[PDB]
Amino acid sequence: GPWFFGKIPRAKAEEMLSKQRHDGAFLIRESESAPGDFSLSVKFGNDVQHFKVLRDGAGKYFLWVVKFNSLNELVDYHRSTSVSRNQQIF
Amino acid sequence: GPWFFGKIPRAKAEEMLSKQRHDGAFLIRESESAPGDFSLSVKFGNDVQHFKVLRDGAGKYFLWVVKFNSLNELVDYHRSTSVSRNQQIFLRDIE
Amino acid sequence: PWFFGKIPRAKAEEMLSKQRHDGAFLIRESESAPGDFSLSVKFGNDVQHFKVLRDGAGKYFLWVVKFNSLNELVDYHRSTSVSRNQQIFLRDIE
Numbered sequence: 002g003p004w005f006f007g008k009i010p011r012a013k014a015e016e017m018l019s020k021q022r023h024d025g026a027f028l029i030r031e032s033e034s035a036p037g038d039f040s041l042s043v044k045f046g047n048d049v050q051h052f053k054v055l056r057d058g059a060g061k062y063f064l065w066v067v068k069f070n071s072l073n074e075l076v077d078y079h080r081s082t083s084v085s086r087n088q089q090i091f
Numbered sequence: 092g093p094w095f096f097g098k099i100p101r102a103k104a105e106e107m108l109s110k111q112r113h114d115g116a117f118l119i120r121e122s123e124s125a126p127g128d129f130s131l132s133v134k135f136g137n138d139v140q141h142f143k144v145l146r147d148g149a150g151k152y153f154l155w156v157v158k159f160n161s162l163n164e165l166v167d168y169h170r171s172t173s174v175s176r177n178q179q180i181f182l183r184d185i186e
Numbered sequence: 187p188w189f190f191g192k193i194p195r196a197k198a199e200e201m202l203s204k205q206r207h208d209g210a211f212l213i214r215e216s217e218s219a220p221g222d223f224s225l226s227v228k229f230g231n232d233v234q235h236f237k238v239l240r241d242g243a244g245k246y247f248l249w250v251v252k253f254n255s256l257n258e259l260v261d262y263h264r265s266t267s268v269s270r271n272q273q274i275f276l277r278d279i280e
């Protein structure tokens with residue numbers, strides 16, 4: 002369904018996710034403190050892992066190395082490439 | 092150039108604006124309320140015009156039609172394309 | 187509400203230094219590294235600068251105590267001094 006939840010509190014995001022049935026359900030939340038600081042929360046097993054969406058000096062987004070111009074591109078790329086140094090897909 | 096943030100009491104923020112030498116001078120206001128919406132406060136003459144920063148389901152930012160991947164990109168774009176659909180206003184930094 | 191804009195360092199510090207209360211502050215965001223922050227804090231006629239440090243878990247801190255967000259760090263230092271020798275508490279500009 003939707004994956005962007007705006008400035009939803011970390012704890013509420015984890016409550017949402019933690020209840021999901023499937024390994025790979027995710028959301029992106031935006032920091033209330035830092036405009037355009039995004040986090041990706043992903044359910045896996047009994048935990049919910051959290052990845053900061055990094056920005057480079059041109060404002061591109063990335064998790065580790067590869068850069069994306071938009072959150073949508075990052076999400077779609079990580080539908081087939083793992084977000085973790087562990088096998089984590091959507 | 093760097094961005095500076097601070098909790099100006101809104102009235103003082105508006106006083107600071109419009110006293111700038113350029114109409115295009117602007118600030119970004121961050122909503123106190125739950126969504127945390129963003130707005131642009133832009134000087135024009137002695138008044139301050141307000142532009143809502145709208146968001147879609149992919150997290151993009153926009154004012155009218157064209158969408159932007161960051162607030163920074165929106166600002167930089169409107170340094171060269173007018174922010175208003177009537178009067179020609181171009182965003183400028185605080186002087 | 188929070189207002190941010192592109193104020194030149196020198197003008198920002200001039201405005202700050204002119205504030206009536208020690209501890210009045212602004213947050214500066216890096217030009218090079220989006221979301222890299224420092225705190226500019228009035229103390230007398232000076233402006234002290236505290237880098238917002240980040241660790242390997244993404245926590246925010248200035249000295250020893252670590253916080254989960256920039257907001258938590260700032261609010262904590264509204265009631266606990268940012269300086270060890272000087273009693274300096276963050277407050278909004280007026």
Ligand SMILES: NC(=O)C[C@@H]1NC(=O)C2(CCCCC2)NC(=O)C[C@@H](c2ccc(CC(=O)O)cc2)/C=C/C[C@@H](Cc2cccc3ccccc23)CNC1=O
Nearest residue numbers: 122128129130131140141142143144145153154155175176
């Ligand atoms: N992005 C825009 O604002 C463009 C456009 N501009 C305006 O209306 C003018 C003023 C400046 C000159 C140009 C017209 N803005 C306004 O009068 C007020 C402006 C404003 C500014 C700040 C704040 C404070 C804050 O939210 O924190 C609130 C509201 C209102 C914007 C609402 C918008 C109607 C609307 C509402 C909800 C969802 C929408 C989705 C898609 C389209 C429109 C939607 C009408 N408004 C324009 O569509």
Ligand SMILES: NC(=O)C[C@@H]1NC(=O)C2(CCCCC2)NC(=O)C[C@@H](c2ccc(CC(=O)O)cc2)/C=C/C[C@@H](Cc2cccc3ccccc23)CNC1=O
Nearest residue numbers: 093214216223224225234235236237238239240247248249
């Ligand atoms: N969080 C802290 O700052 C704690 C401590 N700060 C200080 O002692 C005081 C300030 C109060 C009075 C004098 C001492 N800080 C400073 O003088 C400089 C203060 C500053 C802040 C912002 C501006 C403006 C701007 O960059 O745009 C300029 C300078 C930060 C200094 C950096 C810090 C060391 C550091 C940090 C991050 C990564 C590092 C990687 C490798 C090595 C060192 C690293 C040293 N400094 C303190 O760790």
Ligand SMILES: NC(=O)C[C@@H]1NC(=O)C2(CCCCC2)NC(=O)C[C@@H](c2ccc(CC(=O)O)cc2)/C=C\C[C@@H](Cc2cccc3ccccc23)CNC1=O
Nearest residue numbers: 011040050051052053054055063064065240241242243244
């Ligand atoms: N993009 C990435 O996160 C890659 C990588 N992430 C991780 O290793 C794992 C999560 C999965 C299981 C354990 C490892 N995340 C973390 O440790 C912390 C994780 C996180 C996510 C969301 C929340 C808040 C919430 O909950 O909203 C808090 C923390 C992200 C990042 C912190 C990062 C260090 C760092 C800090 C600042 C600037 C940096 C610039 C360049 C490189 C690193 C920087 C270390 N961490 C990873 O660089």
